[PDB]
Write a protein that binds this ligand. Sequence first.
Ligand code: 8FX
Length: 293
Amino acid sequence: SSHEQFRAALQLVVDPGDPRSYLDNFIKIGEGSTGIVCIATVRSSGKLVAVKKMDLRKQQRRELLFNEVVIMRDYQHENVVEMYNSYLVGDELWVVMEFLEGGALTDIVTHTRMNEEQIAAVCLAVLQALSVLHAQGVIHRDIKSDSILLTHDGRVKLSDFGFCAQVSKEVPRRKSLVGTPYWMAPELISRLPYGPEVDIWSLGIMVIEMVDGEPPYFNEPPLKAMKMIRDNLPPRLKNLHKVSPSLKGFLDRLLVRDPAQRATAAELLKHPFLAKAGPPASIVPLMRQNRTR
Ligand SMILES: C[C@@H]1CN(C(=O)c2nc(Nc3cc(C4CC4)[nH]n3)c3cc(Cl)ccc3n2)CCN1
């Protein structure tokens, strides 16, 4: 049947065997839309790893977990969480990854104000990842603060590629409605042909997260937020008058409704706002203390 076909297919691109041959002491530390994140310990070693566990039977778009394992195989980039191995355990896909001990950007945003040196540092790190991914035809399609992980020394890496897509010379655009409603680009909510530009819109929403502490429409039912994103003017900062002209001029190039006028990752990397971008040390205080907005 279709599930057995897909499971056989997935078995062909993952590593063989059971990672319980070398992983001990699984503990759930978090969850996302497709499954849970555990920490585990390499047997006979002190090495800590993160393991994503996704039940195939619960997935709305199982083919995109194929994309994650395949496209991100041995992807080595300073701003991308490293994937080590993948396995099929019963009806679950397990993906063994680097453990980032600074936590997720979501936790920083909810507990503290960030200054613009810190906001620019985070944006620089994400756009360096996206600029390369987009040049290779990879659309992430789930950019948001929960997809951003930090090290204790303040490095910033992108993860959560479970919704990603590959575009090509032959098939340069997608139309699938995929992502997290409050961060979705309007042309994607509209199921119009779209390219990597949808990640740039989502980054704009994450910038609003970093400035305001939440995305626009965050307490609205998700279908209503999607209707307002699709139909209304781009959402604005609640704290509009507390940010510099540089940051607003930057944000104005991300939250552009027309994908053909929205800035690309490579263009944004040249923007004057990112000359503010602080070094890893500027991020470190954000994981150790809180400062209300
Ligand atoms: C849907 C997921 C849910 N998340 C967590 O559960 C998650 N991941 C972490 N560290 C990771 C994650 C990974 C890959 C991605 C396995 N490596 N290191 C965390 C580290 C600390 Cl200190 C505190 C809380 C954490 N929560 C954050 C990412 N988005």
